[PDB]
Amino acid sequence: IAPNLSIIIGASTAAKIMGVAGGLTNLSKMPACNIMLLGAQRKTLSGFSSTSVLPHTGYIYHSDIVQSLPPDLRRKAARLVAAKCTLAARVDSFHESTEGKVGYELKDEIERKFDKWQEPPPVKQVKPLPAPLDGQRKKRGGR
Amino acid sequence: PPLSYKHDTKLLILALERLKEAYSVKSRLNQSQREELGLIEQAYDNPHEALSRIKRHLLTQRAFKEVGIEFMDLYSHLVPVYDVEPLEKITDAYLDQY
Amino acid sequence: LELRAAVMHDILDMMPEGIKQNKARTILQHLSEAWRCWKANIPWKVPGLPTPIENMILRYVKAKADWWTNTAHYNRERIRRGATVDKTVCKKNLGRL
Amino acid sequence: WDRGIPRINTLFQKDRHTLAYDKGWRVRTDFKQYQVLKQNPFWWTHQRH
Amino acid sequence: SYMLPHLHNGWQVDQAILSEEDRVVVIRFGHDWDPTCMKMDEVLYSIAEKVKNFAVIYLVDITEVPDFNKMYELYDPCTVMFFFRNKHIMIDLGTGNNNKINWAMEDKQEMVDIIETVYRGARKGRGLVVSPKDYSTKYRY
Amino acid sequence: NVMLESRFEKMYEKIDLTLLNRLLRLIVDHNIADYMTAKNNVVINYKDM
Amino acid sequence: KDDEEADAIYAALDKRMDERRKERREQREKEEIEKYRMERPKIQQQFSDLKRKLAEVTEEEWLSIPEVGDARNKRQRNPRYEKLTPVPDSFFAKHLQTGENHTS
Amino acid sequence: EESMKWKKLTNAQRSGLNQIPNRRFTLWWSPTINRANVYVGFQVQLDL
Amino acid sequence: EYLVSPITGEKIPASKMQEHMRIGLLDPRWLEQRDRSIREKQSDDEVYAPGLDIESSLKQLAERRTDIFGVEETAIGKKIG
Amino acid sequence: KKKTIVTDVFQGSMRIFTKKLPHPDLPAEEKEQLLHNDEYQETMVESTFMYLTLDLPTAPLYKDEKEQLIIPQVPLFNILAKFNGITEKEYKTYKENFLKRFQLTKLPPYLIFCIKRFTKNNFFVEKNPTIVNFPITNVDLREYLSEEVQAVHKNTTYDLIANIVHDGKPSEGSYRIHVLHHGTGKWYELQDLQVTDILPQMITLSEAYIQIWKRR
RNA sequence: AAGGUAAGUAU
């Protein structure tokens, strides 16, 4: 039914989002922002900050690929995976790319973006202390 | 705290004065100190806007920014010192006074 | 300092000669990076670091961490007992604590 | 003058009207050690109160 | 301690002192194996990049290169000397010896400040500069 | 007659936020109590830690 | 020449005066470092097993070691100079107003 | 001294500029510190 | 598929709209900044010793420090054993 | 008295294979030349043991890839990789290194496991917090035994009956033991005078220090 | 016993 969307988030998360959306057709006719919040629960915070009890997090946020990133990058991961899943669902609802070529391409793009986020920082030059100077310096006036 | 609380401005004035007590004998100002003291002056200039922001934070704000920690090196034992954001500091000070 | 010198000498001893010219400082940089990651209580993992060199650096960091903790605690005991100390040693001890 | 705890001269202070709403100030002065890095040698009292 | 450039004979030391016309030539006389020299060399290594605009740091072994032992009284475990435009720049550290730093420092900023003071004084054309910090005592309390 | 003087050891470090919030509901508004208790659940930073 | 002979004679004399306990104290020192060495091994010895495993590191692995890059951004590494400014005049005004007292 | 308090200066420059209060204090009481009864030792005549 | 250039008035194939626009509005300040940067990083003298020199210095240290290296342990400064 | 109750119950036999290693700075050709000498060749030492000392892997020094420190987990067979012909364990003495291999030859009727939780580092004594995952009902040690001794030892399955667990810092050490009441499947945790019924699953989650196993 | 050298240019 959804060969492309299965590749990205797996069949279990696919089943959950398809069931909660009301259908593959209903899933496709839905923006990626709403799909990311599919399955979200307004969990009560019991004397804790709203950050501790993950808000605005749905099935995609708890998917295997999204949960595999460090917690400081899981929001961007959830957004990107939700966008690509929306694209795959729109492709799937028309029963195109039944092989999964669109799904494989989207998963490869997601993995490349995740690797870029995990990329080690580049070498950054150390700025030496400025040499002391005694020459006169002319400075402008005005307002 | 009611919107038309009678003692609302007195508590805000006390909180702002307590926040400014850290610079009473200061001679130089850090950029962070400059910004915080400018926030205090702005809150004093427009007490009602500051009170409205405080009520909005008390009603809706549940997530806060990180707090910096340092330790006063008393030779017997370390005493934690916490650095809260100035925007949240005003709300906390007013809440404590009230 | 003695531990860092020993680790650097051991690692550079079995490095191929043709590459010691341009990579002697890189391994010291990796060693310092691992140490500062341990100080920051932050995970340290270099994907391109070979496993034997990674284990060598891990052992270095473990030994340095033991020495660092013991030095911090001994210095703090000296501070509490009233031992005559300077401001720089107290600042370093406060940071370590 | 200069007798009593609190001092009599505190009655003539110009901030008496606003200091009457300062409640729990002594615990605040003792709790200021966790906010300001400097150590207060007068943690036990407030000059205005 | 081992990352700094080394000078292996007196002629190299003379050339290093002569080569730099716009930077202070900081030369540490001692042994890489001496603990005091290890501390001083670690301090110099921590600041080597920072002061590279107005200072260059070299290390000399006084056993491999004994050509300056009698001249500069290099009979201490560690010794740091400052040269600017082929002139030895003395510094009034308050220790009674104004010609060298014969102990090991612990603060990078301390050594950087001393280097900066030497650089400024030597640029103005002075043979003696006054250290920003006195060392008649170790300030231990 | 006996004089006992002591301390509540680890008083601050052992305060549960859920129990503190639920006890604060008893004396203040549920919104104020939630704000005060959520304020203690913040990220603590020191240099790179 | 004869200066070297005199120096050698005096040095040999000083060495001979040291033979009273030289071998005894040197064997005691040998037997004393080894007592200390078992409890506190040499630093290089503690890395001997790890060093041995560096032999099988291929030359390609040796080259492929990455460089260390700082994670701090421009603001953290090289912050702009932080200016210091005097406290506002309102502080002096409020300090001098504090000393004012009512007459009733 | 006031003007330099708010200028961009290095640590050595600021350390040098914190000594003027000490110099003023020392010269204010100079007829007392600079005494042979206080500092027992030899005398050095200031040049010029 | 030629689209008129809004900055030069010429025509470019649609496959090169974005790159032509990005290159066309490239400040020469970028060129001079890059030239300055190239001049700076190719003229600063190296501060630390080369790798072979580091290895030689560490070898000398190991020779003269037998309390850390070697099998036999001589004094701190001696090299015989 | 060679055969006492303690010897017949707990004492087993293991074979030690020791291979001395030359100095690391020695050249490869000279190392091979010294390989001809019997000093650096394998030496067989057959010595009986009262208990088996299992050494844990070094505790993790950093956090995981997800910025959250994780309690180390090790399979029982991973710390049981000792006492077999394949694993070679380096012994770094203060003077020379050795490659001491261990080979089990005689399994005692009751086996005692002593996990080295406390090791003294270069400056103080540290406790290894590594948690060992071990089944408490079926472990087979026939693989570790030699082909010559597996025929005589037809029984190798061991069942845990007791597990001494150390909790806390070495200075403020606390000792608790999870005993198995014979005749019932219940497990009892014995902390001082307090006896608490503990489910069999919770035992493996504790820092095991001393274990005793029954062949049955 | 020290922490108490002005840095010079000329003769």
Curated annotation (Swiss-Prot), chain A:
It comes from the Eukaryota. One of its GO terms (biological process) is mRNA splicing, via spliceosome. Residues 120-143 are annotated as: Disordered. Keywords: Acetylation, Coiled coil, Disease variant, Isopeptide bond, mRNA processing, mRNA splicing, Nucleus, Phosphoprotein, Retinitis pigmentosa, Ribonucleoprotein, RNA-binding, Spliceosome, Ubl conjugation. Phosphorylated by PRP4K during spliceosome assembly. GO terms for molecular function: identical protein binding; protein-macromolecule adaptor activity; ribonucleoprotein complex binding; RNA binding; snRNP binding; U4 snRNA binding; U4atac snRNA binding. The record marks H56, R79, K84 as: Interaction with U4 snRNA and U4atac snRNA. Residues 1-119 form the Nop domain. The record marks R75 as: Interaction with U4atac snRNA. The record marks C33 as: Interaction with U4 snRNA. Ubiquitously expressed. It is found in: Nucleus; Nucleus speckle; Nucleus, Cajal body. One of its GO terms (cellular component) is U2-type spliceosomal complex. Changing H56 to A/K: Reduces binding to the complex formed by U4 snRNA and SNU13. Its main location: nucleus. Involved in pre-mRNA splicing as component of the spliceosome. Required for the assembly of the U4/U5/U6 tri-snRNP complex, one of the building blocks of the spliceosome. Interacts with the snRNP via the Nop domain. The coiled coil domain is formed by two non-contiguous helices. Belongs to the PRP31 family. This is U4/U6 small nuclear ribonucleoprotein Prp31. The chain holds residues 215 to 357 of 499 of the full protein.
UniProtKB/Swiss-Prot annotation, chain G:
The modification Phosphoserine is found at S48. Widely expressed. It is found in: Nucleus, Nucleoplasm; Nucleus speckle. Phosphorylated by PRP4K during spliceosome assembly. The modification Phosphothreonine is found at T85. Involved in pre-mRNA splicing as component of the U4/U6-U5 tri-snRNP complex, one of the building blocks of the spliceosome. Enhances dihydrotestosterone-induced transactivation activity of AR, as well as dexamethasone-induced transactivation activity of NR3C1, but does not affect estrogen-induced transactivation. It is linked to Retinitis pigmentosa 60: A retinal dystrophy belonging to the group of pigmentary retinopathies. Retinitis pigmentosa is characterized by retinal pigment deposits visible on fundus examination and primary loss of rod photoreceptor cells followed by secondary loss of cone photoreceptors. Patients typically have night vision blindness and loss of midperipheral visual field. As their condition progresses, they lose their far peripheral visual field and eventually central vision as well. This is Pre-mRNA-processing factor 6. The lineage of its organism: Eukaryota, Metazoa, Chordata, Craniata, Vertebrata. The gene is PRPF6. The chain holds residues 96 to 199 of 941 of the full protein.
Curated annotation (Swiss-Prot), chain H:
The chain holds residues 1510 to 1557 of 2335 of the full protein. The gene is PRPF8. Widely expressed. Residues 4-17 are annotated as: Important for branch point selection. Part of the U5 snRNP complex. Component of the U4/U6-U5 tri-snRNP complex composed of the U4, U6 and U5 snRNAs and at least PRPF3, PRPF4, PRPF6, PRPF8, PRPF31, SNRNP200, TXNL4A, SNRNP40, DDX23, CD2BP2, PPIH, SNU13, EFTUD2, SART1 and USP39. Component of the U5.U4atac/U6atac snRNP complexes in U12-dependent spliceosomes. Within the minor spliceosome, which acts on U12-type introns, interacts with PPIL2 and RBM48. Core component of U2-type precatalytic, catalytic and postcatalytic spliceosomal complexes. Found in a mRNA splicing-dependent exon junction complex (EJC) with SRRM1. This is Pre-mRNA-processing-splicing factor 8. It comes from the Eukaryota. Coiled coil: none annotated. It is linked to Retinitis pigmentosa 13: A retinal dystrophy belonging to the group of pigmentary retinopathies. Retinitis pigmentosa is characterized by retinal pigment deposits visible on fundus examination and primary loss of rod photoreceptor cells followed by secondary loss of cone photoreceptors. Patients typically have night vision blindness and loss of midperipheral visual field. As their condition progresses, they lose their far peripheral visual field and eventually central vision as well. The lineage of its organism: Eukaryota, Metazoa, Chordata, Craniata, Vertebrata. It is found in: Nucleus; Nucleus speckle.
Swiss-Prot record, chain J:
It is found in: Nucleus. Residues 1-216 form the USP domain. Signal peptide: none annotated. It comes from the Eukaryota. Belongs to the peptidase C19 family. The U4/U6-U5 tri-snRNP complex is a building block of the precatalytic spliceosome (spliceosome B complex). Component of the U4/U6-U5 tri-snRNP complex composed of the U4, U6 and U5 snRNAs and at least PRPF3, PRPF4, PRPF6, PRPF8, PRPF31, SNRNP200, TXNL4A, SNRNP40, SNRPB, SNRPD1, SNRPD2, SNRPD3, SNRPE, SNRPF, SNRPG, DDX23, CD2BP2, PPIH, SNU13, EFTUD2, SART1 and USP39, plus LSM2, LSM3, LSM4, LSM5, LSM6, LSM7 and LSM8. Deubiquitinating enzyme that plays a role in many cellular processes including cellular antiviral response, epithelial morphogenesis, DNA repair or B-cell development. Plays a role in pre-mRNA splicing as a component of the U4/U6-U5 tri-snRNP, one of the building blocks of the precatalytic spliceosome. Specifically regulates immunoglobulin gene rearrangement in a spliceosome-dependent manner, which involves modulating chromatin interactions at the Igh locus and therefore plays an essential role in B-cell development. This is Ubiquitin carboxyl-terminal hydrolase 39. It comes from Homo sapiens.
